[PDB]
Amino acid sequence: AAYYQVVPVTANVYDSDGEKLSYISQGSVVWLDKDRKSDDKRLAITISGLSGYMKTEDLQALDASKDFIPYYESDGHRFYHYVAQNASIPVASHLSDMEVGKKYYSADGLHFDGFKLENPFLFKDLTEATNYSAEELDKVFSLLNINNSLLENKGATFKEAEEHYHINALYLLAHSALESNWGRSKIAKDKNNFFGITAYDTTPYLSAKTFDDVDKGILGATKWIKENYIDRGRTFLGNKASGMNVEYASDPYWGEKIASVMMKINEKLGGKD
């Protein structure tokens, strides 16, 4: 088969030496890499920019004529990644080279056969501050119809986090928006944890860190990201080959999802970043 799906809760991706490179989530679809040798025990695969090996034990072959394979498609305005059969995210503007309503396939969401995407928020250095003020960030709740969020009117706390820890406040708002459903998840409400801090795939709610209030949750999560990711040389969102997505989340499209939210906010607020 050309495509395989991950069966266990997570599965590792290995290099040719058998060293772990990353891990990916249950249901993730990987491509067989025909330029490298596979055998009975391990398949050469590609996922989210990463070329490595996976154990056959962890995979199930798909038939693309009847099983869901992630793809990209333009509506003529935006280019969308269907990350799941019933979920799409906008990743880029429509290019003239895209046929509307045609399915396109890509192992990294940047290289296509007939065009190349810029996803600049995916590779942006997150130590550079946003050009949005606290009041501008606060406006996005009304502009994107975000109701009942714990993060409403916390633009000033995001900008303090940025000032103190030197982490981009648009990124911190987009990460909390994606990870905690705009501070509306049960982890957000019970634990003031908007960033999935230690929300491990095996037991996400139980493992998730507890913070004292919303402001200490924003500041404490920012400290945790600075100390565990930025200070360790993971300074952009990226994918399974580089960036925070290598370690932060099993989801191969976590970085692309946060970049998409940054793109959507930036557009609504007038494109200052």
Ligand SMILES: CO[C@@H]1O[C@H](CO)[C@@H](O[C@@H]2O[C@H](CO)[C@@H](O[C@@H]3O[C@H](CO)[C@@H](O[C@@H]4O[C@H](CO)[C@@H](O)[C@H](O)[C@H]4NC(C)=O)[C@H](O[C@H](C)C(=O)O)[C@H]3NC(C)=O)[C@H](O)[C@H]2NC(C)=O)[C@H](O[C@H](C)C(=O)O)[C@H]1NC(C)=O
């Ligand atoms: C839109 O819904 C949201 O989707 C998000 C994905 O797009 C989803 O993300 C979930 O978030 C957490 C943080 O990203 C993430 O947790 C990581 O889990 C792995 C374990 O599976 C941790 O790695 C282990 O770490 C220990 C200690 O370091 C190691 O000993 C161990 O070997 C590691 N295991 C492996 C297999 O390598 C990882 O820890 C890293 C390495 C770390 O400590 O820095 C965890 N990350 C963090 C930051 O703690 C999890 O993978 C991810 N889930 C998916 C599918 O990606 C949101 O989840 C939230 C948290 C929630 O459910 O409320 C989704 N949000 C909602 C509202 O649904």
Ligand SMILES: [Ca+2]
């Ligand atoms: Ca190696």
